[PDB]
Design an enzyme around this catalytic site. Structure first.
Site, mmCIF file in Angstrom:
data_model
loop_
_atom_site.group_PDB
_atom_site.id
_atom_site.type_symbol
_atom_site.label_atom_id
_atom_site.label_comp_id
_atom_site.label_asym_id
_atom_site.label_seq_id
_atom_site.Cartn_x
_atom_site.Cartn_y
_atom_site.Cartn_z
ATOM 1 N N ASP A 133 0.848 -1.176 0.000
ATOM 2 C CA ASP A 133 0.000 0.000 0.000
ATOM 3 C C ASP A 133 0.892 1.236 0.000
ATOM 4 O O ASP A 133 1.212 1.765 1.060
ATOM 5 C CB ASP A 133 -0.959 -0.028 1.194
ATOM 6 C CG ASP A 133 -2.364 0.457 0.876
ATOM 7 O OD1 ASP A 133 -2.695 0.566 -0.325
ATOM 8 O OD2 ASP A 133 -3.123 0.716 1.835
ATOM 9 N N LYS A 135 0.589 4.465 -0.299
ATOM 10 C CA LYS A 135 -0.228 5.662 -0.170
ATOM 11 C C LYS A 135 0.630 6.759 0.456
ATOM 12 O O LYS A 135 1.699 6.466 0.987
ATOM 13 C CB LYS A 135 -1.464 5.371 0.688
ATOM 14 C CG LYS A 135 -1.181 4.678 2.017
ATOM 15 C CD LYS A 135 -2.185 4.988 3.107
ATOM 16 C CE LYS A 135 -3.562 4.407 2.872
ATOM 17 N NZ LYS A 135 -3.576 2.936 3.052
ATOM 18 N N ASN A 138 2.119 6.640 4.272
ATOM 19 C CA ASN A 138 3.266 5.802 4.587
ATOM 20 C C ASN A 138 4.574 6.574 4.425
ATOM 21 O O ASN A 138 5.594 6.182 4.983
ATOM 22 C CB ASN A 138 3.283 4.539 3.722
ATOM 23 C CG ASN A 138 2.307 3.494 4.214
ATOM 24 O OD1 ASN A 138 1.323 3.189 3.546
ATOM 25 N ND2 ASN A 138 2.562 2.957 5.395
ATOM 26 N N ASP A 151 7.231 0.863 7.319
ATOM 27 C CA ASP A 151 7.402 -0.555 7.062
ATOM 28 C C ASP A 151 6.049 -1.240 6.874
ATOM 29 O O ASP A 151 6.005 -2.433 6.591
ATOM 30 C CB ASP A 151 8.171 -1.224 8.201
ATOM 31 C CG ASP A 151 7.463 -1.125 9.541
ATOM 32 O OD1 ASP A 151 7.144 0.013 9.939
ATOM 33 O OD2 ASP A 151 7.233 -2.183 10.169
ATOM 34 N N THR A 162 -5.687 0.267 -0.057
ATOM 35 C CA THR A 162 -6.362 1.385 -0.694
ATOM 36 C C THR A 162 -6.343 1.178 -2.205
ATOM 37 O O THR A 162 -5.275 1.095 -2.809
ATOM 38 C CB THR A 162 -5.712 2.709 -0.274
ATOM 39 O OG1 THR A 162 -5.284 2.556 1.079
ATOM 40 C CG2 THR A 162 -6.642 3.896 -0.397
HETATM 41 O O1 LIG Z 1 5.939 1.123 11.789
HETATM 42 C C1 LIG Z 1 6.014 2.432 12.092
HETATM 43 C C2 LIG Z 1 5.339 2.927 13.195
HETATM 44 F F1 LIG Z 1 4.599 2.070 13.964
HETATM 45 C C3 LIG Z 1 5.390 4.249 13.541
HETATM 46 C C4 LIG Z 1 6.126 5.148 12.774
HETATM 47 C C5 LIG Z 1 6.169 6.582 13.169
HETATM 48 C C6 LIG Z 1 7.402 7.207 13.362
HETATM 49 N N1 LIG Z 1 7.529 8.492 13.736
HETATM 50 C C7 LIG Z 1 6.396 9.193 13.931
HETATM 51 C C8 LIG Z 1 5.122 8.674 13.771
HETATM 52 C C9 LIG Z 1 4.976 7.339 13.389
HETATM 53 C C10 LIG Z 1 3.597 6.807 13.208
HETATM 54 C C11 LIG Z 1 2.624 6.963 14.192
HETATM 55 C C12 LIG Z 1 1.339 6.473 14.021
HETATM 56 C C13 LIG Z 1 0.979 5.809 12.835
HETATM 57 N N2 LIG Z 1 -0.325 5.303 12.635
HETATM 58 C C14 LIG Z 1 -1.418 5.475 13.593
HETATM 59 C C15 LIG Z 1 -2.055 4.137 13.883
HETATM 60 O O2 LIG Z 1 -2.477 3.478 12.693
HETATM 61 C C16 LIG Z 1 -1.366 3.264 11.827
HETATM 62 C C17 LIG Z 1 -0.713 4.565 11.432
HETATM 63 C C18 LIG Z 1 1.961 5.663 11.840
HETATM 64 C C19 LIG Z 1 3.237 6.158 12.030
HETATM 65 C C20 LIG Z 1 6.820 4.663 11.669
HETATM 66 C C21 LIG Z 1 6.751 3.335 11.343
HETATM 67 F F2 LIG Z 1 7.435 2.891 10.243
#
Ligand SMILES: Oc1c(F)cc(-c2cnccc2-c2ccc(N3CCOCC3)cc2)cc1F
Length: 289
Positions: A133, A135, A138, A151, A162
């Site tokens: 995905d 999008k 990410n 990741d 999506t």
């Molecule tokens: O696997 C990773 C992870 F878990 C975290 C981050 C990350 C790194 N620095 C700041 C913020 C984040 C981050 C915080 C929250 C989310 N989400 C909210 C819950 O649903 C999924 C998306 C995504 C990314 C990066 C990664 F690759």
């Protein structure tokens, strides 16, 4: 286990950054070791996935992934039916968020992010990994302005996501080659330039249908180069797409669109980012004088 061996008592939980079906994210701070007081994102997942009568942690794919524009698994450890991945903490926000505000990006701003994403995608393809995905949620930004792929979408090449960023073969579930990733590359590009997805209908059904047969009209505010690249990226035969060839990513690299890009300086983060994002740290939040 994982990239480096570590345990719970080596980390300090500060916040919960978010929560999804995958698991739960924390902000954490390293307390032991040479990198004491280094902030991290701790992703903890409920141990689910299992095959060959053994719980397989298929977040063992980050072991070999090491690249400036991709997240690095620093540590990892499992504990009472939960697997804990410690990753990079990025405090520039998503590229989704900035898209939501700016609406559309300058062709030079797009050129930048795509180029760094190109390097990222190549690295993963060099390891046999595909990004399901791809999008804009990410693609995170660091405080500098450079990107980092998360990741979440990683998966070995050897159904969900999506649908707008999905490629035609993936819609028909014909298999997720690395050529699919270059399609989504095309989508991200079209989207960043037009502030609109190239295929979208009333519902997920109509959108998927459109991906398969619906002819796309090039917006004519895009340069000849940008148009050229999109036309080549959006080809419904994966083998005829740009990237899916002998050279590989060099096809993408040696294109009129990227003709200003110094790929060696880009890699070493020596080219300056177009936009410096905001951070939760007190420096960017406080008012002064
Ligand atoms: O696997 C990773 C992870 F878990 C975290 C981050 C990350 C790194 N620095 C700041 C913020 C984040 C981050 C915080 C929250 C989310 N989400 C909210 C819950 O649903 C999924 C998306 C995504 C990314 C990066 C990664 F690759």
């Amino acid at each position: 286990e994982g990239h480096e061996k570590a345990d719970p008592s080596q980390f300090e939980l500060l916040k919960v950054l978010g929560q999804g079906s995958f698991g739960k994210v924390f902000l954490v701070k390293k307390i032991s070791g040479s990198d004491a007081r280094q902030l991290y994102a701790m992703k903890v997942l409920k141990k689910k996935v299992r095959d060959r009568v053994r719980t397989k942690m298929e977040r063992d794919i980050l072991v070999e992934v090491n690249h400036p524009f991709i997240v690095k698994l620093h540590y990892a450890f499992q504990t009472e039916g939960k697997l804990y991945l410690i990753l990079d903490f990025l405090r520039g926000g998503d590229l989704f968020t900035r898209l939501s505000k700016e609406v559309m990006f300058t062709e030079e701003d797009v050129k930048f992010y795509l180029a760094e994403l190109a390097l990222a995608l190549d690295h993963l393809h060099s390891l046999g990994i595909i990004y399901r995905d791809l999008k804009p949620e990410n693609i995170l930004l660091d405080e500098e302005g450079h990107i980092k792929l998360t990741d979440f979408g990683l998966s070995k090449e050897s159904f969900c996501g999506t649908v707008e960023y999905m490629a035609p073969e993936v819609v028909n579930r014909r298999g997720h080659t690395q050529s699919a990733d270059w399609w989504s590359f095309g989508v991200l590009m079209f989207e960043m330039l037009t502030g609109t997805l190239p295929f979208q209908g009333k519902d997920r059904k109509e959108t998927m249908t459109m991906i398969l047969k619906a002819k796309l009209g090039m917006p004519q505010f895009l340069s000849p180069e940008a148009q050229s690249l999109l036309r080549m990226l959006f080809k419904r035969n994966p083998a005829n797409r740009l990237g899916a060839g002998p050279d590989g990513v060099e096809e993408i690299k040696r294109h009129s669109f990227f003709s200003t890009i110094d790929w060696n300086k880009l890699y070493r983060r020596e080219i300056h980012p177009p936009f410096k994002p905001a951070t939760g740290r007190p420096e960017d939040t406080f008012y002064f004088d």
